[PDB]
């Protein structure tokens, strides 16, 4: 069907997404990890937003988002972010759930 599972950012860095060895771009997954407190950056366009999400394991992944985030993405918490592998490395996410 489609592997909409929750995967750690570290996973999708260490010889996976980053390196394009296992998950090819264009697939859906959900990254789930902790928001780097000072990595939420936004366009003045006010409709393009991107952020870095990592783990204690220190494998930071970059997520891109092309609409207004919900709670402006309150930083310094965990979140789960779903969409599609966009630019073969970057996740084009949109279904973010601040379930944390």
Binding-site residue numbers for heme are 100
Hey, what are 1's tokens? 């069907």
Annotated binding-site members: 100
Judge contact between 59 and 11, C-beta under 8 A.
yes
CA distance 10 to 49: 21
């Amino acid at each position: 069907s489609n592997l909409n599972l929750f995967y750690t950012p570290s996973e999708i860095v260490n010889g996976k997404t980053d390196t394009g060895v296992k998950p090819e771009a264009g697939q859906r997954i959900r990254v789930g990890g902790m928001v780097t407190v000072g990595s939420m950056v936004r366009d003045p366009n006010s409709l393009h937003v991107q952020f870095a999400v990592h783990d204690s394991l220190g494998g930071e992944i970059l997520v891109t988002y092309d609409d207004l985030l919900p709670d402006l993405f309150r930083e310094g918490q965990g979140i789960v972010a779903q969409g599609v592998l966009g630019e073969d490395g970057k996740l084009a996410a949109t279904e973010v759930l601040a379930k944390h």
